[PDB]
Amino acid sequence: ELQASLNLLQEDQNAGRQVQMNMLPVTPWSIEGLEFSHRIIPSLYLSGDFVDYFRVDVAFYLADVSGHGASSAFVTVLLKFMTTRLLYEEFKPSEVLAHINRGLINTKLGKHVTMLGGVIDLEKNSLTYSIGGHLPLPVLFVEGQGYLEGRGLPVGLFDRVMELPPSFSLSLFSDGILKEKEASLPEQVAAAGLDGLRQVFGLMPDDIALLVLS
Amino acid sequence: LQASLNLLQEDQNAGRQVQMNMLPVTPWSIEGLEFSHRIIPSLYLSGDFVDYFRVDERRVAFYLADVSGHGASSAFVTVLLKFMTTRLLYESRRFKPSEVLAHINRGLINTKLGKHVTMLGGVIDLEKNSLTYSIGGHLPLPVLFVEGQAGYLEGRVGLFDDATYDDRVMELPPSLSLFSDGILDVGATLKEKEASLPEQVAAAGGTLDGLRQVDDIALLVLSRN
């Protein structure tokens, strides 16, 4: 048998999956013609990948935590907490990646987080984004059109501004396959493929999460 | 990765051990104050957490936190706690103790899993032999062991947005213990009886945490002599 000691863990794992469920924003949430929407596919129960976008007065990001499981799930919580703390207590995300850096630098769990920061200023149709990871760069424009330029040497352990078209379509991705060949493929598949274009792309062990803006 | 269950247990262990390096070591003593604890998880990870940090040697902080229920969901909340406190440390260029329960309250109040935590805050000053403690829960009051005697300190979470926090100051003779909603682990079946039993058992028991070594159950004991 031995199912008991398992079913209990799965019932415990689910309690953590669902606690992350109410933690992420809903989709597809749109504001002033901007459809913020995402798709996260956890490793069955708990995912270290998290995505959250809120309107300051618009911020957004995609975070991929090292490895997977309970340990990785804990880190995402901190992230969701720190960002909402800055809200209660304008700027550039490069300064926000440093704030998150300090949280992780204390190395409470000794976990480094790779994220894709971004803030769109409805005023002046400008998007300022910072990246601190080796994950697949942002892609925009879908069929009409590519990878956004930016140095992601920064990481959780231890600023590019761009105008925004009317219907341009930007997608942030987790470290999900689906080396150099594989990094050239997804940009093309994204073009070939928004949420329904990414799901077909999706159609594994490590968590799979993607955030699309449009 | 194997047997599905075994994989979960290997995953659960990764979370248990990640909380291991998160808690302070024991029995850590400073200026004749032995800060030490004993946490016993139920399902690998635990909602019960204990952390005590020195503060320039002038003052010493400490607390015991019991999170609602148990499991992974509860384990997440403890993380926040450990984070918020260490944030105040870096950010405080230095009043009350209960002021910290409110800070933690705001973290949890603002769309954070809708989890309420019952804690026993406390800050002692090594020089003035005084301990100021605030409590915000209906968990088992602190028991202090002095000359083979025991008693609960008087004092009255954060889900409500109202602070409603009261802090009691009390001088300290020449051994304080915090207990979780966990009981009858080592009488049973009565509420008031069971609240009167532990103080007595604590007294009967070796005052030291050494004895202790011999829903989540976690206890923190302090000792001086």
Measured distance between the N- and C-terminal CA atoms of chain B, rounded to whole angstroms: 50
Alpha carbon of residue B42 to chain centroid:
16
Euclidean distance between CA atoms B39 and B22, whole angstroms: 12
B185 is in an annotated binding site: no
B114 touching A (Cβ < 8 Å) = yes
Q: Which two tokens stand for residue B170?
A: 């009390």
Cis previous bond, B27, omega within 30: yes
Euclidean distance between CA atoms A152 and A129, whole angstroms: 11
Q: Which two tokens stand for residue B130?
A: 């005084």
Phi/psi for B89 (5° steps) reads -60, -50
Please indicate whether, in this complex, the C-beta atoms of B45 and A70 are within 8 angstroms of each other. Answer: yes
Resolution attained, angstroms: 3.0
Phi/psi for A11 (5° steps) reads -75, -25
The runs of H, that is alpha helices, within B116-221 are 191-204, 209-213
Question: In residues, how long is chain A?
Answer: 214
Q: Please, which experimental method was used?
A: X-ray
Residues of chain A in contact with residue B80, where contact means CB-CB under 8 angstroms, are 77-78, 81
Please indicate whether, in this complex, the C-beta atoms of B72 and A12 are within 8 angstroms of each other. Answer: yes
Helix (H) / strand (E) element for B65: namely: strand B59-67
A175 is in an annotated binding site: yes
Give residues with Cβ within 8 angstroms of B166, minimum separation 6: B98, B134, B155, B156
Q: Which two tokens stand for residue B67?
A: 């999170």
Q: Which of B160, B158, B101, B106 is nearest to B132 (CA)?
A: B101
Euclidean distance between CA atoms A135 and A209, whole angstroms: 12
DSSP state of B47: S
Euclidean distance between CA atoms A176 and A205, whole angstroms: 10
Q: Which of B114, B141, B138 is nearest to B199 (CA)?
A: B141
Euclidean distance between CA atoms B57 and B55, whole angstroms: 5
Residues of chain B in contact with residue A71, where contact means CB-CB under 8 angstroms, are 14-15, 18
Residue ranges of domains in chain B, CATH in brackets: 1-225 (3.60.40.10)
Q: Which of A82, A66, A70 is nearest to A17 (CA)?
A: A70
Closest-approach residue (CA) in chain A for B15 = A71
Euclidean distance between CA atoms B196 and A43, whole angstroms: 47
> Strand, coil or helix: what is A52?
strand
Helix (H) / strand (E) element for B5: namely: helix B5-20
Give residues with Cβ within 8 angstroms of A132, minimum separation 6: A97, A114, A115, A117, A152, A153, A154, A155, A156
Euclidean distance between CA atoms A92 and A40, whole angstroms: 26
Percentage helix, strand, coil for chain A under 3-state DSSP, each rounded to 5: 35, 25, 45
> E-assigned strands of A42-76?
50-52, 59-65
**A7 vs A204, A205, A206, CA distance in Å?**
22, 20, 22
Residues of chain A in contact with residue B112, where contact means CB-CB under 8 angstroms, are 23, 77, 80-81, 84
User: Inter-axis angle of helices A93-105 and A70-88, to 10 degrees?
Assistant: 130
The runs of H, that is alpha helices, within chain A are 4-21, 70-88, 93-105, 180-192, 195-202
Measured distance between the N- and C-terminal CA atoms of chain A, rounded to whole angstroms: 50
Cis previous bond, A28, omega within 30: yes
> Strand, coil or helix: what is A184?
helix
Please indicate whether, in this complex, the C-beta atoms of B107 and A81 are within 8 angstroms of each other. Answer: yes
